[PDB]
């Protein structure tokens, strides 16, 4: 009855950040030491929880959200941040409680010009944990777009130019955000204790 963190962290394919993936961890024993004791992570920033004190506390649910961004943008996957990713792709709440784990994936998501996407145009900021997969032509002016691309009428999604020879800030990073939900319900996710 072990929690399926391996399916999330070790997935061969990862989602684009605008279409970010969410795994609902429920009814299992999680051992977080596989995570915080590993040496493969470029970034491991937790908020309101310490990953070392988790292995004997119980939660109603855990969410593992995964996607791919670029290194310069990893600092946006945090409470109280702004930027294209935090505003229009993936938004953490200010009261966020959980961990943001990220590692360089240049050896897996760069080829010789892969196809990961981010949302570039949006009229307003995303709500926390909102997922917008719309592809409606973005209207930058007064004229309606009528589903045709043109001046002031832009396709909302853009492709990362992921090339192996990019600077580290333009290289792909895989990101897993764990967030811990403890409603007033049966707690189904526990540490080995």
């Amino acid at each position, epitope marked *: 009855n072990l929690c399926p963190f391996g399916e999330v962290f070790n997935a061969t394919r990862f989602a684009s950040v605008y279409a970010w993936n969410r795994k609902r961890i429920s009814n299992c024993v999680a051992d977080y030491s596989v995570l915080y004791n590993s040496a493969s992570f470029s970034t491991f920033k937790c908020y309101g929880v310490s990953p070392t004190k988790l292995n004997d506390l119980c939660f109603t649910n855990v969410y593992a959200d995964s996607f791919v961004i670029r290194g310069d943008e990893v600092r946006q996957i945090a409470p109280g941040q702004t930027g294209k990713i935090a505003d229009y792709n993936y938004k953490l709440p200010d009261d966020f409680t959980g961990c943001v784990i990220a590692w360089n994936s240049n050896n897996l998501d760069s080829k010789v010009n892969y196809n990961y996407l981010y949302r570039l145009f949006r009229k307003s900021n995303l709500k926390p944990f909102e997922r917008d997969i719309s592809t409606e032509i973005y209207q930058a*002016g007064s004229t309606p777009c009528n589903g045709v691309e043109g001046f002031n009428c832009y396709f909302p999604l853009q492709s990362y130019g992921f090339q192996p020879t990019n600077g580290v*800030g333009y290289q792909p990073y895989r990101v897993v955000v764990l967030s811990f939900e403890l409603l007033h319900a049966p707690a189904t996710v526990c540490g080995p204790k």
Partner: antibody
Amino acid sequence: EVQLVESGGGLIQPGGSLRLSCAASGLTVSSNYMSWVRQAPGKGLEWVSVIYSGGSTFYADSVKGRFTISRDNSKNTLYLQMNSLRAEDTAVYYCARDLDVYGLDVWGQGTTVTVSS
Amino acid sequence: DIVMTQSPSFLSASVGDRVTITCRASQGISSYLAWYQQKPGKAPKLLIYAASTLQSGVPSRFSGSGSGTEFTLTISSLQPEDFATYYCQQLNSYPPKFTFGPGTKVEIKR
């Protein structure tokens, strides 16, 4: 026919303040990445400020804390409030629409700000 | 921060010549580059985005190429109107730092 016309530039003493306006026609300011880019006399282009449609703002390190970008959707207008001005801030100030991957495609014709006693 | 340089600083060529200006980035920035033309006193005019895509309404003699660390703007046949300072700029910085290049002043030889 899209135009951006800026205004509010002129002579101002060091330490003074100054508000630049940029009226737009042919695009909606509140729906666009809008930026201020300046050019000191005889020098190159220096990005100053940007505001996102969702409201996020960002500034260059040289004007951080002293400049504030803003907008008014009712008037379809972008604003650059400049405080604690120094002679290094003397420049032509351009208003521009950023398309991020497609570049800064629409520019105003600039407004000149001289900081001198 | 990533540094943008340009070469040469000044250039003179005859009408009809094939002009080539170079922009270099301190680190590989893929295709995230734009090219602008600025006449003295006037506002910059966007020529190239995405390192190679020609902006709509820009004469076909202007072309852009490169990716990673080195980029070139190429005027296939220099025209009298083409004298100006040409700037390159790095796109999609985070935190946003719309870094421009030093510029290349192109003068018409006759």
